[PDB]
């Protein structure tokens, strides 16, 4: 099968800077009719793929002319003249000259932007959930950059890891930030054995944690 | 407008089969190839095969021969892919696509291969503690707990609250998924304007609209 090798496999690009992805084929992609069926797709997290370029250099309608494609035979390039926040996602070259059709491995384009501190919010369990005998405490660490972050829970002033699960969003298509949720799941009985619930975010934007807390006795 | 409407999320027991559909509209169905593409969780894209509805011609990736069978109902302009004898390697999103000088894509069908039971979510509000300090903005949310299989969708105010929304990827434990979604609005508008999360768990036919109300003891 035709092996398509993309370089680099990841890009981190500042807004306004150009970018370039290489795609190299193990076989000529020139077809019998004179056409070269090397196309480029983009897939955002949460979306279906979309085609941007077909037969090396033709631009799909509605795709900004910031995107251009070039190449011949076995060496191909996708170029972005200036990157915008909405260009994030995974770019693929794909070939239709030879059966079976094949895809490159994908190049993840991440946006690089100014550092941003997380906005931290903590939420007590709902009365609805407590009626069912459960108690989840949720902390959001929203709209920060860069993506690396750590969360620590303190319950009545003491660190707690038991029952904590974390989840990170993909990069935001508008502001280029990341967000994270941290959820501490307890039974109602266990939740009712402690008063102060604290979520602490450690991020490069501060030398000390950003801390949000609530007390069980304050509704 | 050209549309490819794929069938909804599937749960398939190991060793069983499934047939997913791609209903085309807005163009002459017989005149364009339909391709099928696989995306396993976290991996790239793979080509399965294609059908030309006009004459039923097919071409397959040999990797999927004996796993995938492609057909097309010309009268209903619907393409189908049958997947046989499923294993965990078949859990993936499957897309259909209409080839052409413009390409159009289905929204994808998630297939989960599992012996675990469908379970609807419990949806809980996330509202700040009553003694929390007030800011110019307030962040609210919904906790979507204990469902199976994927996916769930969350919107806020029927999609009218778009910016300032973060829906987090679910976490899996004990064959149940949990996720939360957050939204930020001006503090002057809540609760005077209602904020509601709209949760859908298609595999269990569950739709829940949860209004976020200030805590009151």
């Amino acid at each position: 099968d035709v092996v398509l090798t993309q370089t680099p496999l990841t890009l981190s690009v500042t807004i306004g800077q150009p970018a370039s992805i290489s795609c190299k084929s193990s076989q000529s992609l020139l077809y019998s009719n004179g056409k070269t069926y090397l196309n480029w797709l983009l897939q955002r997290p949460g979306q279906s793929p979309k085609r941007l370029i077909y037969v090396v250099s033709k631009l799909d309608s509605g795709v900004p002319d910031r995107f251009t494609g070039s190449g011949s035979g076995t060496d191909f390039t996708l170029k972005i003249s200036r990157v915008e926040a909405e260009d994030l996602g995974v770019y693929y070259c794909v070939q239709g000259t030879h059966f079976p059709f094949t895809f490159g491995s994908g190049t993840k384009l991440e946006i690089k932007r100014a550092d941003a501190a997380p906005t931290v919010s903590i939420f007590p369990p709902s009365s609805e959930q407590l009626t069912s005998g459960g108690a989840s405490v949720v902390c959001f660490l929203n709209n920060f950059y860069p993506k690396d972050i750590n969360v620590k829970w303190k319950i009545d002033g003491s660190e707690r890891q038991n029952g904590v699960l974390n989840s990170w969003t993909d990069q935001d298509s508008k502001d280029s930030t990341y967000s994270m949720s941290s959820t501490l799941t307890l039974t109602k009985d266990e939740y009712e054995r402690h008063n102060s619930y604290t979520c602490e975010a450690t991020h490069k934007t501060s030398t000390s944690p950003i801390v949000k807390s609530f007390n069980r006795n304050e509704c | 407008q050209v549309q490819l409407q794929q069938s909804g999320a599937e749960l398939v027991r190991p060793g069983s089969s499934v047939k997913i559909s791609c209903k085309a509209s807005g163009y002459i169905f017989n005149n364009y190839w339909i391709n099928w593409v696989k995306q396993r969780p976290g991996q790239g894209l793979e080509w399965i095969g294609q059908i030309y509805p006009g004459d039923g011609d097919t071409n397959y990736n040999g990797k999927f021969k004996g796993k995938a069978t492609l057909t097309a109902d010309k009268s209903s302009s619907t393409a189908y892919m049958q997947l046989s004898s499923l294993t965990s390697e078949d859990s993936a999103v499957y897309f259909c696509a209409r080839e052409g000088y413009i390409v159009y894509w289905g929204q994808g069908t998630l297939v989960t291969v599992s012996a675990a039971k469908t379970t609807p979510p419990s949806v809980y509000p996330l509202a700040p503690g009553s003694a929390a300090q007030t800011n110019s903005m307030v962040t609210l949310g919904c906790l979507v707990k204990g469902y199976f299989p994927e996916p769930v969708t969350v919107t806020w105010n029927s999609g009218s609250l778009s910016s300032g929304v973060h829906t987090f990827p679910a976490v899996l434990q004990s064959d149940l998924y949990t996720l939360s979604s957050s939204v930020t609005v001006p503090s002057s508008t809540w609760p005077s304007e209602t904020v509601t999360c709209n949760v859908a768990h298609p595999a269990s036919s569950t739709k829940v609209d949860k209004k976020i109300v200030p805590r009151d003891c």
């Binding site: 056409k35 069926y37 196309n39 797709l41 793929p49 085609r51 077909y54 037969v55 794909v94 070939q95 239709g96 000259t97 059709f101 | 002459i28 017989n30 005149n31 364009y32 190839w33 391709n35 593409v37 080509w47 030309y52 006009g54 696509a97 080839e99 052409g100 000088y101 390409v103």
Partner: peptide, 12 residues
């Protein structure tokens, strides 16, 4: 997404 002119219509 692979061979844009492989169906009924080829531009000419």
């Amino acid at each position: 997404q692979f061979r844009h002119d492989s169906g009924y219509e080829v531009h000419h």
